[PDB]
Design a protein around this ligand. Structure first.
Ligand SMILES: C/C=C1/C(Cc2[nH]c(Cc3[nH]c(CC4=NC(=O)C(CC)=C4C)c(C)c3CCC(=O)O)c(CCC(=O)O)c2C)=NC(=O)[C@H]1C
Ligand SMILES: C/C=C1/C(Cc2[nH]c(Cc3[nH]c(CC4=NC(=O)C(CC)=C4C)c(C)c3CCC(=O)O)c(CCC(=O)O)c2C)=NC(=O)[C@H]1C
Lengths: 482, 482
C-alpha cells in the first residue's frame, strides 16, 4: 500500500543543515543561482545581494584557488579565516553545486582509520561466525566515529528490519535483537540510500536552513539534493529520532552484491558532526564488511552443497548394490530425510505412497498429492507455510508446515515430497507493529510512534525456510530416480 | 630436502642491513647481549663497550623516554639527532630484540594509502576479470611504494611460479608471462615467508652488518632473525638480484585461506627504503587482494556448478521420457559430453562399449577398461597425461590425453569414461630451466643463473586439467545407475 510515508519527496525539501553552506552556479560565467540562507556567515555579504553574481565575485580567493582539483577530485580542503573547511562539488539540475562544511581537525584520523581497516581484514575475521564479523564492524565504526551507539541493521525480505549486532557505551539503552516495521525506512528513502550510501543528521533538534530562491527558476520546483551532503531530512524522521531521544544520527548503506542488504546505524545522545573525510573512512569499513560477508556466505554455501552432495553419493552407492528400491529408501531413510533437512518424506513411485519418517496420513498425502499435480511449477514446488496455501492441512503444522515437492515425471503425478513441522519463533518488535505511526484526525499528517518498547509476537504454522542447498539436493535426488 | 638451496639456514646468517640498528636485551636488568656492529652510528659509543650494560645506560634518552609505549604496543616513533626513527620490538631466543629503522617522512602517507584501499576494496572489483584485479593490485602497490616494477607472482602446484600481472614504469624490462624455476624460491624461504609476510632488501649491493658476538652465548649459534625487519638475506639471492639488474627489492606474501598462494614482488633499479608503516600499508593491500580473489573464485565455482547442474537436470528430464538408455544417450550426446567439458565418452553398461563423440577405437577402450578395472580407485579416477600412467594410449594424445572415469558399480566393471585431447601449451621461461643454477666445480658453492632471457618450451600430451565442477558433474552423472 503506497503509504503517505512513501510519497514524501525527501530530495525536494528545500533545506540544508545549519553546520554548512550550499551554493549553486549555472553556465559559463558560473553565476550564483541558489544559495542557502545562512551563507552570510561564510561569504561576508548577505545572501540575497549575491544572487546573479559571477563566482569570482562571491567566493573568497581561497576557494577559487582550489577550483581545478575541486572540479577534478570533487572535494578539497580549504582554510578560510573562519577555520578549516571541506569543499564538495557535484552536479544537479544542470547547476554546479558546491557545499562547504567544517573540515576534519584530527591530524591522525587517517592513521587511526588504517588501524581499524586492519582489524576488519585481519588474517581471517568471522572465525566464530558471521556474528563475530558484524560485532567487529560495529565496534570499529564506533571506535572511529565516537557515536554512543552503533547497530548493524539487516533488511528482511519484506523490507522490515532487525538489529543483528550492536556496539554502544556503558549505561546505554540498546535494540539488539529487535525488529522494526518496513515503514520506518519508506520505499523512496531506500531507493535514495541505494544510490547515496551515507547520511549525517548532525543535530536532530536544529531547524533546517532554507534555499534562496525556494525553487530553481527554470524548473519551478526545489533543487534536487539527492547527492547533497548537507541535505536536511524529512521532518517526520526528525520526530522519530527525537522520540528515540537521540540528538544526532549517522547511517551508512550496506550494499552487498548490488542490493541493499542493510544499514549501519549510529546514534548519539548529543549533537555531533562527523567530518566528510571521517565519513569516507567509515564507508571503507562498510564496503569491507560487505566483502567479508559475500566471501563467508559463498563458503558457507559451498560447504553446504558438499555435505548434500556426499549424501546423494552415499545414496547412489546404496542403490547399485541390491535391486530393492523401497527397501534401501527404508534402511537409508535418514539420509533421504537429511538431504533437505526434513522430518518426513512421501515417495510416489506409483502404487501406494511410500511414507518414510514422520509424515501426514496416507489419505492426507494422496489428497495434497492430487492437489499438487495441478499447479504451475515445472520440476519443484516449495513453501514454508503450507496451511496458508492448502487449508486441508492447516491443522497439521506439527508435521507439514512446510513441504518441498519435486516432480519425477513429465506428465503423470510421480512425486517426492519432503515435509517439515512448524518452528515457533518469538520476535520482539520495537514498539507495537500494529500501530507503526500515529496519524492525525483526517489522515493527512503522520507522526512516528511514540514508543519503542519490546512488543512480543510468536510466529506459528511456518517451518524453517527452504534454503538453496535443499532445493539443489532435491533436484539431484530427482536425477537419481529416472 | 634436495637442493643445497634448501639447506641454507637463512634465519641464522647473523647479519642486518646497514640502514638500521639491532639491539637485544636479556633478563630483568635488560642487559645488552647482542648488538649490530654499526650500533655506534646511532649510539655515539663503540658497540663492544655496551655489551653487558643495562638498557638504561646504553639507549639514548630520546628512546628511553618512549620505553613504555614501545614495550606496550611494540612500535614507536622517536626523534634522534640522526633523524626520525621507528623503534620496533620483538622477542627471539629469550631476548628482547630492539630494531631501529628510518621512520616515514611523508605526513600524508596514511591518507594516501586509504585512497588506494578504496581503489582495491571497491565493489565493481572484478568486472573485467580476476586479471583486472591483479593488475589493479600491482598498480596500487606500485603507486604507494614508488618501485620501478611490481609483479603479481603465483605459485603453481609444483611451486614453480609465473608472473600473472605487472605494473612498471615506462621503458622497463618486463617479466609478465614468464615462468620461474621453483628453486628460485627454495623450500625454507617459502616456509619463512608463510609466517613472516613482508621483506625489504633496501640495497642489493650493500654488505651486511654483522652481530656482536657472532653467536648468542647461551645457544652457540647466531640470533634467530626470523621476525627481524632488518635481516640481511641469503647471499645467493643478493647475487640473483644483481644478475637481474635490480638495486632494491621488496615482496609481500599473498596468503589465501592459510596457504602461500604467491607473491607481490617489487624491484627498484636504485637502492630505496620503504618505511615500516608504509610496508604495513601495502600489507593491507595484499590481504585485501586475497579477500577479493577468494570471493570472485568462489563465485566462479558456484556459477560452474549451476551450469553443470542444469545439464544434469536436463538429462534427467530426457530420462523418464521415451525410450531406452542408449536411445536418450544418442540425442543427449552433447549434454553428456559437456557435463565434463569432454570430446568423447565411452559407456560400459555391460554389453559392448557405447562410444559417443571422439573416442579411441573399441578394442582400445576395452584394453583401457580391463586395466582401469584393476586400479585402486573408489568411485572416480582422472588424469591429464594418460600416457604416463598407461602407455598403450600414449600415442593417442589426439583423443585420449586426459580421462575421467567414474565407476557405475561396486565389485563390477561398469564405467563411464570421458576423454580429452591434448592441449599444446607454450611456456616461456626466464632463462633455461634445465640449468636453474650455476655451481662451481666440486659443487660446494652455488650461484644464480646468469641470464633470464625468454626460453620457450611447448607442453605436449597433456589435456586441460579436470576441475572440481567436472568432478562434481561426473559424480552426479553416476547418480543415474541402471
Ligand atoms: C510515514 C513515514 C515514516 C518514516 C519516514 C522516514 N524515515 C527515514 C529515514 C530513516 N529511518 C531510519 C530507521 C531506523 N533508525 C534506527 O536506528 C533503526 C533501528 C535501530 C531504524 C529502523 C533510519 C536509519 C533512517 C535514515 C536516517 C538516519 O540514519 O537516521 C526517512 C528518510 C529520511 C531522509 O533521508 O530524509 C523517511 C521519509 N519513519 C517512520 O517511523 C514513519 C512514521
Ligand atoms: C640455490 C639457491 C638459490 C636461491 C635461493 C634463494 N632465493 C630467495 C629469495 C627470493 N627469490 C625470489 C625470486 C624471484 N624474485 C622475482 O622478481 C621473481 C620473478 C619475477 C622471482 C622468481 C624472491 C621474490 C625472493 C624473496 C626476496 C625478495 O623479494 O627479493 C631466498 C631467501 C632470501 C631470504 O629471505 O633470505 C633464497 C635462499 N635463488 C636461486 O635462484 C638459487 C640459485
Amino acid at each position: 500500500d503506497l503509504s503517505q510515508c512513501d510519497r514524501e519527496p525527501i530530495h525536494l525539501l528545500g533545506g540544508i543543515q545549519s553546520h554548512g553552506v550550499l551554493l549553486a552556479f549555472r553556465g559559463p560565467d558560473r553565476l550564483l543561482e541558489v544559495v542557502s540562507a545562512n551563507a552570510q556567515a561564510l561569504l561576508g555579504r548577505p545572501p540575497e545581494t549575491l544572487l546573479g553574481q559571477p563566482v569570482g565575485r562571491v567566493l573568497p580567493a581561497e576557494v577559487l584557488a582550489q577550483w581545478e582539483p575541486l572540479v577534478a577530485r570533487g572535494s578539497v580542503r580549504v582554510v578560510l579565516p573562519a577555520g578549516a573547511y571541506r569543499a564538495l562539488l557535484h552536479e544537479s539540475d544542470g547547476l554546479t553545486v558546491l557545499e562547504l562544511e567544517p573540515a576534519e581537525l584530527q591530524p591522525g584520523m587517517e592513521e587511526t582509520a588504517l588501524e581499524v581497516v586492519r582489524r576488519l581484514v585481519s588474517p581471517l575475521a568471522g572465525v566464530k561466525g558471521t556474528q563475530a564479523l558484524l560485532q567487529t564492524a560495529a565496534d570499529t565504526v564506533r571506535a572511529l566515529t565516537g557515536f554512543d551507539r552503533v547497530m548493524v541493521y539487516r533488511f528482511d525480505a519484506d523490507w522490515h528490519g532487525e538489529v543483528l549486532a550492536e556496539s554502544k557505551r556503558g549505561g546505554m539503552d540498546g535494540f539488539l535483537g529487535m525488529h522494526f516495521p518496513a515503514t520506518d525506512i519508506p520505499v523512496q528513502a531506500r531507493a535514495l540510500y541505494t544510490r547515496n550510501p551515507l547520511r549525517l543528521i548532525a543535530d536532530a533538534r536544529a531547524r533546517p536552513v532554507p534555499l534562496l530562491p525556494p525553487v530553481v527558476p527554470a524548473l519551478g520546483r526545489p533543487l534536487d539534493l539527492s547527492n547533497s551532503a548537507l541535505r536536511s531530512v524529512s521532518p517526520v524522521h526528525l520526530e522519530y529520532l527525537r522520540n528515540m531521544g537521540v540528538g544526532a544520527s549517522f547511517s551508512l548503506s550496506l550494499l552487498k552484491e548490488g542490493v541493499l542488504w542493510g544499514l549501519i546505524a549510529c546514534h548519539h545522545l548529543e549533537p555531533l558532526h562527523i567530518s566528510h573525510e571521517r565519513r569516507r573512512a567509515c564507508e571503507v569499513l562498510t564496503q569491507l564488511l560487505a566483502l567479508q560477508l559475500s566471501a563467508e556466505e559463498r563458503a558457507a554455501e559451498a560447504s553446504e552443497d558438499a555435505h548434500r552432495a556426499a549424501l546423494l553419493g552415499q545414496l547412489a552407492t546404496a542403490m547399485g548394490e541390491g535391486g530393492t528400491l523401497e527397501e534401501v529408501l527404508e534402511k537409508e531413510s535418514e539420509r533421504v530425510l537429511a538431504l533437505t533437512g526434513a522430518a518426513g518424506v512421501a515417495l510416489l513411485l506409483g502404487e501406494e505412497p511410500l511414507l518414510v519418517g514422520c509424515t501426514p496420513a496416507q489419505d492426507e498425502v494422496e489428497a495434497l498429492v492430487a492437489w499438487l499435480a495441478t499447479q504451475p511449477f515445472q520440476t519443484s514446488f516449495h513453501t514454508d507455510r503450507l496451511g496458508t496455501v492448502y487449508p486441508p492441512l492447516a491443522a497439521r503444522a506439527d508435521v507439514a508446515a512446510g513441504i518441498l515437492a519435486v516432480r519425477l515425471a513429465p506428465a503423470a503425478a510421480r512425486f517426492a515430497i519432503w515435509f517439515r513441522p512448524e518452528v515457533a519463533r518469538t520476535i520482539s518488535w520495537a514498539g507495537n507493529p500494529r500501530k507503526p505511526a500515529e496519524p492525525e484526525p483526517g489522515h493527512q499528517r503522520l507522526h512516528p510512534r511514540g514508543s519503542f518498547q519490546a512488543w512480543e509476537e510468536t510466529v506459528r504454522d511456518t517451518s524453517l525456510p527452504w534454503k538453496r542447498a535443499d532445493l539443489g539436493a532435491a533436484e539431484g535426488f530427482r536425477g537419481a530416480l529416472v
